[PDB]
Amino acid sequence: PARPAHPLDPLSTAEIKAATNTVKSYFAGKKISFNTVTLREPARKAYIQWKEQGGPLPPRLAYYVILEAGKPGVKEGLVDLASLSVIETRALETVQPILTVEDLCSTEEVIRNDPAVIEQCVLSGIPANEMHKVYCDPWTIGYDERWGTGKRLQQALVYYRSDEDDSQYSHPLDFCPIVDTEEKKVIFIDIPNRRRKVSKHKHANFYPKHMIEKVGAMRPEAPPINVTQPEGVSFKMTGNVMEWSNFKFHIGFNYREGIVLSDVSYNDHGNVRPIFHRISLSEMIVPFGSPEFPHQRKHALDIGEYGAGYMTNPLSLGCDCKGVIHYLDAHFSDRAGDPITVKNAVCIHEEDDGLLFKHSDFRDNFATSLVTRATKLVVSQIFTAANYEYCLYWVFMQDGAIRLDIRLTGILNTYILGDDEEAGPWGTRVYPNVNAHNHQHLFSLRIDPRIDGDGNSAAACDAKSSPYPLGSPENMYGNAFYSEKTTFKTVKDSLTNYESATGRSWDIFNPNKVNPYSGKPPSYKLVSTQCPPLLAKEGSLVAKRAPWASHSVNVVPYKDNRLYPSGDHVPQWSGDGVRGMREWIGDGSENIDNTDILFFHTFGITHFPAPEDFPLMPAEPITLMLRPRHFFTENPGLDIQPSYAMTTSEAKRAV
Amino acid sequence: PARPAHPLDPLSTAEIKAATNTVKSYFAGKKISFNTVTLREPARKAYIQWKEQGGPLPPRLAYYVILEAGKPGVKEGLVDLASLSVIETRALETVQPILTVEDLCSTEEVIRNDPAVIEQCVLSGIPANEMHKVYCDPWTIGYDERWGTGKRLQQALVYYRSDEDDSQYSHPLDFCPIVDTEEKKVIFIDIPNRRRKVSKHKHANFYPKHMIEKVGAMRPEAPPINVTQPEGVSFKMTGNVMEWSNFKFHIGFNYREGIVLSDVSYNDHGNVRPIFHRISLSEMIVPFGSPEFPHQRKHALDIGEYGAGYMTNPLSLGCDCKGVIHYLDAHFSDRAGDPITVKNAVCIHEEDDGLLFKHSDFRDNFATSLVTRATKLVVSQIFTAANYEYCLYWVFMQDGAIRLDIRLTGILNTYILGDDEEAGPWGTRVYPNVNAHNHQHLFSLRIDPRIDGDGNSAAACDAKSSPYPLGSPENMYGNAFYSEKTTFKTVKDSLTNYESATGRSWDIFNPNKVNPYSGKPPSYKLVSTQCPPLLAKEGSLVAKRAPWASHSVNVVPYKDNRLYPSGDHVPQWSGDGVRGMREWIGDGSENIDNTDILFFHTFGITHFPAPEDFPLMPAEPITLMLRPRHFFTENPGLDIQPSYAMTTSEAKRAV
Numbered sequence A, B: 001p002a003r004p005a006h007p008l009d010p011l012s013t014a015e016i017k018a019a020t021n022t023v024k025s026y027f028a029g030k031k032i033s034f035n036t037v038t039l040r041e042p043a044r045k046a047y048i049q050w051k052e053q054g055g056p057l058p059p060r061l062a063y064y065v066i067l068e069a070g071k072p073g074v075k076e077g078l079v080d081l082a083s084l085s086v087i088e089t090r091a092l093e094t095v096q097p098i099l100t101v102e103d104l105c106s107t108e109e110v111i112r113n114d115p116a117v118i119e120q121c122v123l124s125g126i127p128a129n130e131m132h133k134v135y136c137d138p139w140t141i142g143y144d145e146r147w148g149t150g151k152r153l154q155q156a157l158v159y160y161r162s163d164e165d166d167s168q169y170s171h172p173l174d175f176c177p178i179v180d181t182e183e184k185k186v187i188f189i190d191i192p193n194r195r196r197k198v199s200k201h202k203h204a205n206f207y208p209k210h211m212i213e214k215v216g217a218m219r220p221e222a223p224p225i226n227v228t229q230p231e232g233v234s235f236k237m238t239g240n241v242m243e244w245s246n247f248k249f250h251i252g253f254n255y256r257e258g259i260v261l262s263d264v265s266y267n268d269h270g271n272v273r274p275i276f277h278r279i280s281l282s283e284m285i286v287p288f289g290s291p292e293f294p295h296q297r298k299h300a301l302d303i304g305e306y307g308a309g310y311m312t313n314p315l316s317l318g319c320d321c322k323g324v325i326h327y328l329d330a331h332f333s334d335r336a337g338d339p340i341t342v343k344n345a346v347c348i349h350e351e352d353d354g355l356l357f358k359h360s361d362f363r364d365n366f367a368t369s370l371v372t373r374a375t376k377l378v379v380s381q382i383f384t385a386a387n388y389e390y391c392l393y394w395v396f397m398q399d400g401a402i403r404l405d406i407r408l409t410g411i412l413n414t415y416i417l418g419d420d421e422e423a424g425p426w427g428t429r430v431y432p433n434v435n436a437h438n439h440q441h442l443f444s445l446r447i448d449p450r451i452d453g454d455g456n457s458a459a460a461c462d463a464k465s466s467p468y469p470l471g472s473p474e475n476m477y478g479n480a481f482y483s484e485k486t487t488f489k490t491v492k493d494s495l496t497n498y499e500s501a502t503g504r505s506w507d508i509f510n511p512n513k514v515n516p517y518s519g520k521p522p523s524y525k526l527v528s529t530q531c532p533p534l535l536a537k538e539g540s541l542v543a544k545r546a547p548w549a550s551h552s553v554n555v556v557p558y559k560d561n562r563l564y565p566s567g568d569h570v571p572q573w574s575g576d577g578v579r580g581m582r583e584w585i586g587d588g589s590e591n592i593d594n595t596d597i598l599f600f601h602t603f604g605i606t607h608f609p610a611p612e613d614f615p616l617m618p619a620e621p622i623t624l625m626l627r628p629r630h631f632f633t634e635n636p637g638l639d640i641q642p643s644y645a646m647t648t649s650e651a652k653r654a655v
């Protein structure tokens, strides 16, 4: 296959086909299916040597995961695309892989045709001949101690639609079928002691026709707000390489993490300085808070169990991206080994972002004034996880900061509620017979830094009052306060949480350099306040399967392929064993001071449903920022043309 | 004077003149000057009775504060505009009032002509004949135990400009002159033991001409991003009354708080429901963290000591407000009693605000999809406090939420640093010989609620794991968690801080009503995470003068005229005495459950300067939100026309 323009470019449709042909040949005579075919990124050192030391172009490699009929677990390996050959291979019989759309799409039909399920629907008030009205969201079983990884399983959250255009979530059923993904059959059904028959209320719908019927009618179409860029955009893309306002980086994408930003640098007036080698979301977990069976199985690790790439929405229609947009397509492999494409998976564009800075002199009644507007570069994707939608926006700003904005929307996860049943403290009755369980949305931001070069460290920064008392010579009026910086020496030191008591922030810096003015090392500071503590207790399935979620920050030594904190194959893992973040942390004694490190940050929200979130939920914002502190010697955006500028002398001159 | 169209409208230029003529006559033969002439808002009950019970139009009243030559303190009172007469008056001899632009503008010239100051400049390396190059930011003295309120004082932070177009902040001097505001003379100069002569480095400038000289040249003008509304805006204003996306409220404005939003309601499909009777910023404090003399005097309470109204920038030029804007002018009185106008003090406009909500069905590859874009209504002002600029944005959203966004910009407060001097832990060397001291920016949001009517309460909501252990029948898998709501019964109960350990939020609700679905009282939830603890210690000048800053939340009984938490006349108050928030809290035993309450919220940031903030600082964001929870029975924006919408049946039909 033809080599890509960039070593970090995702596998092309041709490379994917070449890789699968190679694997099929290697396993000739075997009945195999493809689960994953993706780029195996080049080693960090090899990439940097190629990029800055005239080193050789790294080998183009493809990582694959396959299933073989009648064989337990999976088989994984690497294909050297240049020589069209398998160079690495191994069987993992006790693990289960990410669930693809194809793996999930057949589950609904299997439960509809299962006698045991049909009987439960009849028992629930739905005639056996109306099974076409029964729907279900196919979920990873998460983890069920009754089967471990012995069988590839899915659990089905069952719903009912009186009409195909209904939003089924107002009508969940009370039972949960367990499906054998391979054999495509229901092997068990969890049935509650308390039986709740299907709700007889109207469905809570949200399309215009439904609303016109529910409320008087729709609001009149509002006056349009048009945004146009007659002279084009200021950003320039060369393949997947982006160049904008001094920032330069590679926009990658894969089936799991979705958008992956690499080789991020900033051109500081000719001095191209590295910032991050790689940044992305490496994992997620949405732990629900109802202790009742079988709701403990609701703690989906969406990224590792379904894939932010696989679940991504084509942004073309919908009008998700307003303005002059630039799109990127994503390419994956289907079960048969054929390339599949999701068009407009990533949208890129620039928008006005308010004021960058401003200052006026009161001396001449603000006649002396300088105002510069801000513009931001947005790289976005939106993926759907059954009922929820996650809108991800990677934002680059003209002050050199990088921000990650997430907007949660879609529909609340719902379970049935008896007329007399109290949604108790575990959930909210958002509609008659509808219980929306409490849950958290936690994400694992993975940062591979290269702050102004190689050799980095991390630290926690806490604001604190001077220890000297009020009235002492050292703090006479008791107003003294400073920033206590605690640099992490070993992995154990980094396991820290956000603390409101100190307005804690974290620094990722280069101890080998110093700011000529402040005398502090150049750094990028993580300013993140939406850092919920993990509510599930220690030893819980949730805490064990997402060891990274226990702390807001985890810093470990860099190692190639240390990407996914909950392990490479997440579905059905019990959480027992040294893998993922648990393995990287080890005994916690490894050095992370002035070396190659990986910074994993846990952030998110805790959601206690309210009627306002139903039947469709208004977007809920989540944001974190990485800003330069002591990185530059002065405001880096001062050479940007001001929107307005009047000097004191120019003001006098205007008589 | 002619009566206003609305009882809450600010005083017109005519009412102001009528009020001052009345006061001048009352004090005939006395040499008085006007400090404040503003609207004395009608009693809460009277206003509500007028608005909803056909009650009489409240009396149009004007509150005034005057100074009399040779008399200590001030005189304040009320003028009944209808009868053009003083109906209330009293002398406050031991207090000092807010500092007006006129009070402040003469200070610079007095220090330039003071022999003692001139000598200090010469001693500092500046020739006596170059005093026109010496500048100073006139500050309230804050509080100096050497004079108390016995004399009206100002302190001058001295700077030097080699050229009038320079930004003086790179060149502060080491001494601090104390000025008698009335006598217009320097009565003392604080001189440090360590002498630092003026910096000989170039000034750190930021205008284009300066940048062209500092760096190669300016960046090319970037491609324009145009925003237009060909069919107009969707909001409708009738005087100061705003109507937008079901929201209805009065946009007021005064010399102190700046923007004041009143009588806020939401039209819930014909049912006009009250939300807030009044919301605004009632006070601020920017406490600096250097314990060294005389830096303890740097803890300006900008709102109460200068006025967010008095300091507001005309938004006309500058291009601060992009798009189709609607402006409001502000009117105050000058020292002579004549109305003064600041045009375009408040700008109003609507903007796109991303997605309001979205959901697609994976079953037909997202063909079934509904997308609705969000639009926000922004009411903004920008005021200048000497070196800093505060950009305030009150934002109304289509999900019924109200947000307050603040962007800090302008220039860092700076003090001189010796070549050999360590900015120590109290500040940062952001430029040669420049020390930018640590400081916090704290604000007091004042909320007078009327959540779905009269009779309100407040509570803290903390996320917590179930108390039952992992493995118990009640929490078998240890994932259970709930929201612990603690309703405040007495004032003392409300004194609470944000807690990251529980992701604490606060509810302002109506215990007299219940949501038909959830069974919870209707409420608006305060979601605020930028809540720094007050770093100054108990008993410090800072803590004593801003008793409200000690807690993130303070809830006290409503009383007419309980507006300013640090007292009505803030300058030079020692912090000793029962006034403001200290008086309202009392012994903390008063009831605040199901009654008329006032909710004061302290939020802001802690600032540790870095070179990136100099010589001009990039905007730093601060935000808090008030969102409806259990207020509505479903997403209130569902009747808004979707940007895109395709039904499952419509998707099938498209073959």
Ligand SMILES: [Cu+2]
Pocket (backbone or CB within 6 Å): A408, A439, A441, A607
């Ligand atoms: Cu949620």
Ligand SMILES: [Cu+2]
Pocket (backbone or CB within 6 Å): B408, B439, B441, B607
């Ligand atoms: Cu600041």
